[PDB]
Design a protein around this nucleic acid. Structure first.
Length: 577
DNA sequence: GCGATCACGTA
DNA sequence: TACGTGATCGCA
């Protein structure tokens, strides 16, 4: 039983309530709110949004920090409301974030999935109510109102058992003091968006299309015929049947044509270099130029990413529409894409600050490896020092290739890759990659001990934890399949590193947001990308930020080694280098 | 019109 | 390693 309400009564404006502000469109930016449900001690209420959101008492209640609301995915609601000029405050419990902290592997997508964790099944999955894909539609008011009230009732019923388990896990503060405050910061970041210079992007796309026409023509005269270069089946027939290049790698369906294979085939035929070049130009044009231009809002000329705070098993943020975490950087041709990200006001600048080697610093701290801690206490180039140790040479004797291999070993630790993966990145044998690793563990015995100990702890406890008590369950750690078990072992080692680094960055964003307000700066966070925070600010604030931001980031936690922050500012993201 | 599948970019 | 995303193609 629920009141399908016609107007807002005071009964719906209690001190504590479960609240559903339903946004069905996957991209919630400027998206409709289809319905509102409130469950509190006085009953269960469904409100049409046009009513509720025009009611001054309702809107005042939404924005009253002392009126506590329990929700699922409150950022979606907060942002949808921001686009309507309405502030959502007082969200004291977000079930999406609670479920995520309790077990990130569950993939909790909707209220129903979180409710199942506590054997609560009186709510349907969103996909059963709205449908999937083409046939996705908002159902009739009776069906919609039942669904929203059921979601709000589930939230109401589930808050206590979820907070109880969080407390047993010592994750209650992680929820309340880190993830929920971050959610509000991310909602403001997403709402602010980042201004895009679409003229520059369109000019770049114009350039790429011309080179792509040129390289594509050269490819066709080399293949003796025309074909769809973007089809790895057609390309496979041109390279490996017509031109009879060696087959160095097979895929499930046929001939591998990854850039790894093509680089190896380059000496045999001039086509191969042009294919690689076509692949890189086409990646830029399709994915980044055309892809970015599709999601720039023509009103604001901004992109408004959506940060997914509750997806990764490490606690890292992901982002979509656009995904700004893979804007190119390595190749100069691609890094120029970042010239298109500009401050949103005249006489403002982009300020970007990034942790230097935060993952290895976290590893030095957690493993208490004396050699690694000393390397960071001396602020050495970690890759050079790793080369010196592994190859037992002095700094002047480290060749670029020795540093490259040491860097690949460090990369393998940071991202938890296998010996096979290291071998593949170093283009060496698996046996050779293995002996590289062993030489590393002789130089860093503390890291070796941490690796062994964390795997034993994962086996004993069932999970591993980060510095701020995020956990990752690893049921595959006892699997009898070697590849499955090795992956779980590498995740046991890696997640305390990657996840603690994510924890620090999140804490830094919270501290930064409060410091910006304390200092009454106009600067504002725009993006969190890997280990980098990107802000925009009046040019007149750059000198204050140069001092403030690195300090806040460096003081976010106290490790046994310093945190180091590099920072730059400029007129574009590219120039903030 | 989905859904693998392959390839590629940051990690 | 991961996630996100593209184009292709294979199944309807």
């Amino acid at each position: 039983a629920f009141t399908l309400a016609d107007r807002v009564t005071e009964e719906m404006l209690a001190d504590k309530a479960a609240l559903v502000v339903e946004v069905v469109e996957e991209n919630y930016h400027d998206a409709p709110i289809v319905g509102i449900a409130v469950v509190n001690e006085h009953g269960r209420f469904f409100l049409r949004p046009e009513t509720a959101l025009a009611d001054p008492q309702f809107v005042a209640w939404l924005g009253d920090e002392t009126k506590k609301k329990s929700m699922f995915d409150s950022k979606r609601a907060a942002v949808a409301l921001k686009w309507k000029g309405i502030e959502l405050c007082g969200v004291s419990f977000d079930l999406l974030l609670a479920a995520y902290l309790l077990d990130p592997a569950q993939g909790v997508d909707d209220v129903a999935a979180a409710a199942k964790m506590k054997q609560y099944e009186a709510v349907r999955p969103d996909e059963a109510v709205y449908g999937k894909g083409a046939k996705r539609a908002v159902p009739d008011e009776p069906v919609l109102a039942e669904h929203l009230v059921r979601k709000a009732a589930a939230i109401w019923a589930l808050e206590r058992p979820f907070l109880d388990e969080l407390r047993r896990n010592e994750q209650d503060r992680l929820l309340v003091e880190l993830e929920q405050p971050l959610s509000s910061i991310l909602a403001e970041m997403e709402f602010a968006g980042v201004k895009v210079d679409t003229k520059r992007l369109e000019q770049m796309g114009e350039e790429l299309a011309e080179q792509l026409r040129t390289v594509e023509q050269r490819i066709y005269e080399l293949a003796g015929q025309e074909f769809n270069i973007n089809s790895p089946k057609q390309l496979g027939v041109i390279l490996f049947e017509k031109l009879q290049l060696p087959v160095l790698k097979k895929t499930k369906t046929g001939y591998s044509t990854s850039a790894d294979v093509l680089e190896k085939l380059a000496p045999y035929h001039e086509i191969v270099e042009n294919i690689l070049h076509y692949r890189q130009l086409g990646k830029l044009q399709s994915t980044y130029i055309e892809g970015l231009l599709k999601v720039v809002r023509p009103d604001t000329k901004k992109v408004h990413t959506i940060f997914n705070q509750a997806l990764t098993q490490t606690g890292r943020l992901s982002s979509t529409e656009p995904n700004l975490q893979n804007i190119p950087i390595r190749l100069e041709e691609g890094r120029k894409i970042r010239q298109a990200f500009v401050p949103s006001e005249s006489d403002w600048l982009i300020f970007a600050a990034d942790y230097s080697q935060i993952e290895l610093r976290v590893l030095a701290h957690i493993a208490e490896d004396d050699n690694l801690m000393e390397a960071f206490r001396r602020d050495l180039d970690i890759h050079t020092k790793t080369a010196m140790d592994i190859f037992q040479v002095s700094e002047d004797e480290v060749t670029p290739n020795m540093r490259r291999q040491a860097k690949a070993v460090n990369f393998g630790i940071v991202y938890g890759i296998s010996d096979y993966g290291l071998a593949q990145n170093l283009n060496i044998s698996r046996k050779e990659a293995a002996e590289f690793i062993e030489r590393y563990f002789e130089s860093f015995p503390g890291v070796k001990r941490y690796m062994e100990n964390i795997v034993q702890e994962a086996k004993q406890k069932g999970y591993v934890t980060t510095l701020l008590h995020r956990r990752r369950y690893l049921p595959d750690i006892t699997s009898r399949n070697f590849n499955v078990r090795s992956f779980a072992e590498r995740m046991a080692m890696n997640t305390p590193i990657q996840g603690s680094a994510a924890d620090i960055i999140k804490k830094a964003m919270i501290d930064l947001n409060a410091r910006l307000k304390e200092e009454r700066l106009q600067a504002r966070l725009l993006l969190q990308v890997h280990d980098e925070l990107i802000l925009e600010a009046p040019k007149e604030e750059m000198e204050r930020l140069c001092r403030l931001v690195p300090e806040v980031m460096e003081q976010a936690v106290t490790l046994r080694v310093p945190l180091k922050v590099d920072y730059h500012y400029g007129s574009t993201w590219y120039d903030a280098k």
